[PDB]
Design a protein around this ligand. Structure first.
Ligand code: UQ9
Ligand code: PC7
Ligand code: PGT
Ligand code: PTY
Lengths: 92, 97, 90, 98, 101, 65, 37, 40, 311, 58, 147
């Protein structure tokens, strides 16, 4: 079932080789704090997107309980996002 | 003469097997449910094999051409039921079950 | 023998993380990346054990520890950022 | 305007209904595929059992010969005190994935 | 999903309708339940009003404290009514009402 | 122990665990459920089977020389 | 105490697992093959 | 009141109002409509 | 098994040719929109222009700005080019014409898209120009902020299918395409892909090969996102919804036609609208697209669960 | 009429898209004889192994 | 073979992480550590977890660490439990019993996890949600200077 990653690895190797060939073609002849806040928001919402993936696929087995568990999870992160909003961390 | 029991033949004839081998299949599955030891279920397995290969021989003897193309195309598309429907209807027209 | 290799690799990763926390006491960033290495080693332990024992209690835990590791990264980097501002040095 | 909302909201209803109706057909097709597997499982399992018992006879014949000299031996003694039969373990913690 | 309402420590009082519905528990509220509900709500509203004067927000603090008090008092009253129905608290009136039913 | 399998079936060692735990549910002395505890711990790691196979291989190697 | 694992408070998996025995993800592989009939 | 504060909020925050409305519909359906269909 | 490199070459080389001709097509459509004619002298209709540009760029005798470690600077275009190309190993063109049929293809695409941030960052740092460093730092944040919305839209698409296999997401649209019900989701996905690729109004921005590799990677990302927009919402290789008599046309042609349509929308949007500012890009991506994507996830999941229309 | 000159590079792109998909359908078929199957589960994988063994046997 | 090299590269990368002069190089090797760990997970059949490691570790945490290092200063700096099986597999490989009952309807690593992550163990899921909320709240109060 995991046999479909060998083509991807060979693809990576060959893309490496062709990129090296392309590079070899011409050879033959202060601090800002908002940049940290955006990364923090990305980390949080990337974890949230990670937690969606099992939920979306397995939403047919779980029913009206997993849905509401995910809804409570989203409600908590939405309160967090609202706190993120009113504090001006989303403005530039 | 006797078809080779490979994936194409078995999956193609599964529709008929599920209607003429329920006793033997149920007995074998019940035997496996109690104990999973292979040496204690050889008697039921031989019965299932003998009941399935007889059906496979009968199908090939009755409709040789309507089944050869069906099994070949099943091998071609890797046991895809949706992509093999015209020939499936053709093969199931000769054999009602 | 593959479970032995999988456990040995993660044990070495854990030892490297502890070394980085100990050896690099002067630098703060290494003291965070070493903690993340330790968390990675432990997550690998949990996943390997879950696969070996045929049990789903290690995968759920690895997924739930990813969140803790990420939140620790966030808080630690915020604390470091405010720490550099005050004293002007690391 | 207002007709834009009507057409988008009617599309969101009719299209979701059609998506559900197609998911029903996909589920029926998948169930047919699964039901075609549970009718041929006994013969495959029977062949696997025959092959395994033959190979187990070979393995016991091998182990009986190699250490006939050793006083304390049983030749194919179950390691489980319960007496249940379990498949022989392998040095691979996930063999059927590669 | 499979659920089980059985408790480790058994009920020491007669049990009527072991797994009551939300509407039935709410409909079982007695005078004492309304008294404790109103007491918690009023205490919360008063605390919110008094604590919000110094910042300058009396009404907003009043409403926040009122929401907290309503939630807390309602869950306290629901807890008491459910315990009485399920037999964990003295259900003197519940058995009298549901015996003649 | 939990019984949740990796591939969506019952755990491989769950039946042994349920036999051991059922034994310990009506045995206040744990020296009489040892034979089931050993079975459960052998299903986890296969230590006894691997030891037997290693012994067979070592005996074969000794006979080789 | 003498055999505290025998107490009812310490035996909860013995009463919950039979209730969740038929849940998908915990079934014997041969169980679903016989539920058709 | 309500019909004026709501109007002011919707006018100056159309995207937030739209997202809240569609999310409220998506939460209303499995909370009020699903039990109704469970009777049938 | 020595034929896998043949497949990889057959999927990589035409990709590069298509990227060059996509640059040509952009420069031609942006000209016909502005009531002029693009490059026409070089070829019969300008078709030979990309080859001439490539040869002229190669024959330049360029110098390497080695005023750095010279390792990260040289490998950053390589790092982004590999990641841009590797995402094409899972995209299916017809029923059985996918190089690698992953069962986690959707999340694999999300991962590949999310790791594309490192190339621009390393390029910004390795170049000693401080302003280039700041520009790369801003572009990385924009790409991240819109990657979040792209992931949330992918979740909405995945809910209606129930599997992460890209070749099954297309088969799930045999009844109707997902672009019809989830049309606002399609619009949001297209806009997010516009901002993800640093293109059209969300487009705020060395020598020889490094710039060439960056340019090729960016245009390959454009082609990939145009392919995804039709892979998730326009039915992939599936024919037109009705009138089933033209079925003689191969399924790979319909995928191509829809991808070309989305590329035409890319060029059209670039030609029709001005450029946003950074203080407005981040606000637009954090306050207009995140709430809408989350609300659409909630609405779709609630509607499917309520009527038991789930996969 | 006059707008078709912008569709030539944009049709070359479509030709490239078609050839990328068709290059893996006649090369993969060349050395297998069978088109790639989508949705490989362990049942299909194991059943293919059994097919290979039975064909090798007879 | 594949396991040995994929472990050796990760060990060398971690050693360079804990013993690097320039923190940029340390973070770059810190990325390679997870790049190798993802492949190691893929060798176990946990395709979902490898992809999440790519998404989370070297997609969010590594990017955050890189942001902090770059724009800020770039300043300088066995036989007991499971006895191993000896290489006797010429006969052992033949002794491989396959049960077709568990293959008729096989779950993926994704849906197997999601079957019990949201219903039977949902409290831990909400606790992780609360941890994420704590991180969100603490990011602002520590680092926030408007106007
Ligand atoms: C901003 O200024 C710039 C441009 O103007 C917009 C460019 O066009 C460009 C690049 C333009 C180009 C035509 C470069 C693209 C060249 C290639 C992709 C070479 C591809 C060649 C091959 C794949 C080999 C040929 C393969 C076959 C014939 C196989 C057939 C199937 C750059 C770099 C630039 O900096
Ligand atoms: C329902 C689920 C929960 C919904 C909220 C969840 C999130 C919690 C948010 C809490 C913070 C916001 C709470 C609402 C803030 C608005 C408060 C309000 O509506 O009252 C206004 C105005 O509205 C009023 O008329 C006063 C209402 C307060 C008294 C109402 C009775 C007390 C109710 C408490 C118990 C019931 C709970 C609230 C109702 C459910 C405030 O009065 P002032 O502006 O100070 O008066 C103006 C005059 N002067 C400035 C000069 C002082
Ligand atoms: C138990 C009851 C708790 C409810 C009261 C919570 C809020 C208490 C107020 C503390 C915060 C505050 O606002 O400080 C004020 C102090 O709060 C108070 O003055 C009293 C507030 C109400 C407390 C008692 C009122 C009745 C509550 C009793 C229970 C009913 C400052 O008063 P001042 O500026 O006048 O100080 C100078 C002083 O007057 C000169 O000597
Ligand atoms: C067959 C192919 C068809 C075409 C496929 C491609 C579609 C795209 C084609 C090109 C369309 C134009 C693309 C232009 C790109 C830049 C445009 C961005 C402008 C933008 O983001 O608008 C924002 C708000 O509007 C927005 O939010 C815009 C997003 C809205 C999405 C729609 C959501 C509606 C939901 C209604 C659902 C009801 C039915 C279901 C129940 C800012 O605007 P602002 O300045 O006011 O700032 C917000 C203050 N609040």
């Amino acid at each position: 079932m995991m046999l479909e990653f060998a083509p991807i690895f060979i693809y990576l190797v060959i893309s490496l080789l062709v990129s090296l060939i392309l590079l070899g073609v011409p050879f033959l002849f202060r601090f800002d704090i908002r940049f940290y806040l955006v990364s923090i928001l990305f980390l949080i919402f990337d974890l949230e997107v990670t937690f969606f993936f099992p939920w979306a696929v397995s939403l047919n087995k779980i029913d009206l309980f997993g849905f509401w568990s995910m809804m409570a999870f989203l409600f908590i992160l939405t309160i967090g996002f609202l706190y993120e909003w009113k504090r001006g961390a989303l403005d530039w | 003469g006797n078809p080779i029991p490979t994936s194409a033949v078995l999956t193609a004839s599964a529709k008929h097997i599920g209607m003429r081998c329920m006793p033997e299949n149920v007995a074998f599955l019940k035997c496996k449910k109690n104990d999973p030891n292979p040496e204690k279920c050889l008697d039921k397995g031989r019965d299932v094999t003998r009941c399935v290969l007889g059906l496979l021989k009968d199908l090939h003897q009755k409709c040789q051409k309507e089944m050869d193309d069906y099994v070949g195309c099943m091998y071609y598309y890797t046991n895809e039921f949706d992509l093999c429907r015209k020939e499936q209807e053709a093969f199931e027209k000769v054999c009602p079950l | 023998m593959d479970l032995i290799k999988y456990f040995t690799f993660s044990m070495i990763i854990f030892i490297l993380g502890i070394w980085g926390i100990l050896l690099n006491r002067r630098n703060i960033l290494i003291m965070l990346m070493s903690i993340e290495l330790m968390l990675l080693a432990v997550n690998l332990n949990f996943l390997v054990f879950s696969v070996s024992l045929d049990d789903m209690m290690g995968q759920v835990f690895a997924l739930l520890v990813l969140t803790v590791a990420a939140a620790e990264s966030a808080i630690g980097l915020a604390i470091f950022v405010i720490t550099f501002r005050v004293r002007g040095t690391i | 305007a207002m007709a834009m909302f009507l057409a988008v909201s009617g599309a969101f209803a009719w299209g979701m209904y059609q998506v559900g109706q197609g998911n029903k057909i996909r589920r029926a097709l998948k169930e047919e595929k699964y039901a075609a597997r549970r009718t041929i499982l006994p013969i495959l399992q029977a062949e696997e059992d025959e092959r395994f018992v033959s190979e187990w006879k070979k393995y016991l014949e091998y182990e009986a010969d190699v250490m006939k000299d050793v006083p304390g031996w049983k030749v194919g003694e179950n390691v489980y005190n319960s007496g249940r039969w379990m498949p022989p373990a392998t040095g691979e913690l996930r063999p059927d994935v590669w | 999903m499979n659920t089980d309402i059985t408790a480790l420590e058994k009920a020491q009082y007669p049990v009527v309708d072991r797994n009551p519905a939300f509407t039935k528990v709410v409909g079982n509220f007695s005078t004492l339940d309304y008294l404790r509900f109103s007491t918690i709500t009023g205490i919360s509203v008063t605390v919110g009003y008094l604590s919000g004067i110094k910042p300058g927000i009396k009404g907003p603090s009043m409403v926040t404290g009122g929401l907290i008090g309503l939630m807390g008092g309602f869950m306290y009253a629901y807890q008491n009514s459910a315990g009485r129905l399920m037999g964990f608290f003295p259900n003197d009136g519940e058995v009298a009402s549901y015996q003649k039913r | 122990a939990s019984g949740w399998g990796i591939t969506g079936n019952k755990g491989r060692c769950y039946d042994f665990w349920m036999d051991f735990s059922e034994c310990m549910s009506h045995c206040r002395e744990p020296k009489d459920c040892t034979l089931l505890r050993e079975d459960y711990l052998e299903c986890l790691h296969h230590s006894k089977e691997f030891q037997r196979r290693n012994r067979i291989y070592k005996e074969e190697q000794r006979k080789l020389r | 105490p003498y055999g505290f694992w025998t107490f009812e408070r310490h035996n909860a998996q013995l009463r919950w697992d039979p209730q969740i025995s038929q849940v998908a993800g915990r079934r014997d592989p041969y169980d679903d093959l016989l539920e058709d009939n | 009141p309500v019909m004026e504060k709501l109007r002011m909020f919707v006018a100056q925050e159309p995207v937030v109002a739209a997202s809240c409305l569609i999310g409220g519909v998506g939460l209303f359906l499995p909370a009020v409509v699903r039990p109704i269909l469970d009777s049938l | 098994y020595i034929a896998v490199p043949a497949e990889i070459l057959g999927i990589i080389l035409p990709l590069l040719l298509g990227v060059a001709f996509l640059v040509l097509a952009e420069r031609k459509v942006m000209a016909f929109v502005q009531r002029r004619k693009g490059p026409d002298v070089v070829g019969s209709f300008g078709l030979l222009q990309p080859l001439a540009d490539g040869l002229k760029l190669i024959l330049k005798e360029p110098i390497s700005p080695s005023s750095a470690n010279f390792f990260l600077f040289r490998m950053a275009p390589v790092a982004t080019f590999m990641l841009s190309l590797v995402a094409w190993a899972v995209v299916p063109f017809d029923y059985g014409m996918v190089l690698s049929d992953l069962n986690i293809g959707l999340l694999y695409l999300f991962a590949i898209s999310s790791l594309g941030v490192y190339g621009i960052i390393i390029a910004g740092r390795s170049s000693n120009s401080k302003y280039a460093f700041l520009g790369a730092l801003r572009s990385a944040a924009q790409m991240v902020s819109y990657e979040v919305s792209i992931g949330l839209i992918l979740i909405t698409v995945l809910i209606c299918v129930g599997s992460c296999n890209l070749s099954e997401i297309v088969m799930a649209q045999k009844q109707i395409w997902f672009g019809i019900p989830l049309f606002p989701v399609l619009v949001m996905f297209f806009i997010s892909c516009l901002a993800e690729t640093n293109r059209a109004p969300f487009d705020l921005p060395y020598s020889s090969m490094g710039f060439a590799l960056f340019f090729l990677g960016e245009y390959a990302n454009m082609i990939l996102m145009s392919g995804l927009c039709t892979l998730f919402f326009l039915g992939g290789w599936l024919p037109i919804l009705d009138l089933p008599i033209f079925k003689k046309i191969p399924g790979s042609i319909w995928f191509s036609i829809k991808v070309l349509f989305f590329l035409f929308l890319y060029i059209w949007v670039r030609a029709a609208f001005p450029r946003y500012r950074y203080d407005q890009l981040m606000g637009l991506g954090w306050k207009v697209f995140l709430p809408l994507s989350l609300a659409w996830v909630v609405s779709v999941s609630g509607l499917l669960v309520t009527f038991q229309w789930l996969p | 009429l006059v707008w078709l000159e912008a569709m030539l590079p944009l049709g070359i792109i479509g030709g490239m898209l078609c050839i990328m998909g068709n290059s893996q359908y006649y090369i993969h078929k060349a050395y297998h004889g069978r088109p790639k199957h989508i949705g490989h589960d362990e049942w299909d994988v194991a059943m293919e192994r059994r097919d290979k063994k039975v064909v090798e046997k007879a | 073979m594949i396991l040995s090299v994929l472990s050796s590269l990760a060990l060398v990368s971690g050693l360079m992480v804990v013993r690097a002069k320039n923190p940029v190089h340390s973070v770059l090797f810190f990325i390679l550590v997870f790049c190798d760990t993802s492949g190691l997970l893929l060798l176990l059949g946990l395709d979902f977890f490898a992809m999440i490691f790519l998404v989370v570790y070297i997609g969010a945490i590594a990017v955050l660490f890189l942001f902090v290092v770059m724009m800020f200063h770039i300043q300088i700096a066995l036989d007991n439990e499971s006895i191993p099986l000896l290489p006797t597999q010429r006969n052992t490989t033949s002794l491989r019993y396959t049960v077709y009952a568990g293959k008729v309807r096989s779950w993926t690593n994704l849906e197997t996890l999601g079957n019990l992550l949201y219903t039977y163990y949902f409290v831990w899921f909400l606790v992780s949600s609360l941890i994420l909320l704590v991180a969100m709240i603490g990011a602002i109060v520590l680092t926030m200077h408007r106007t």
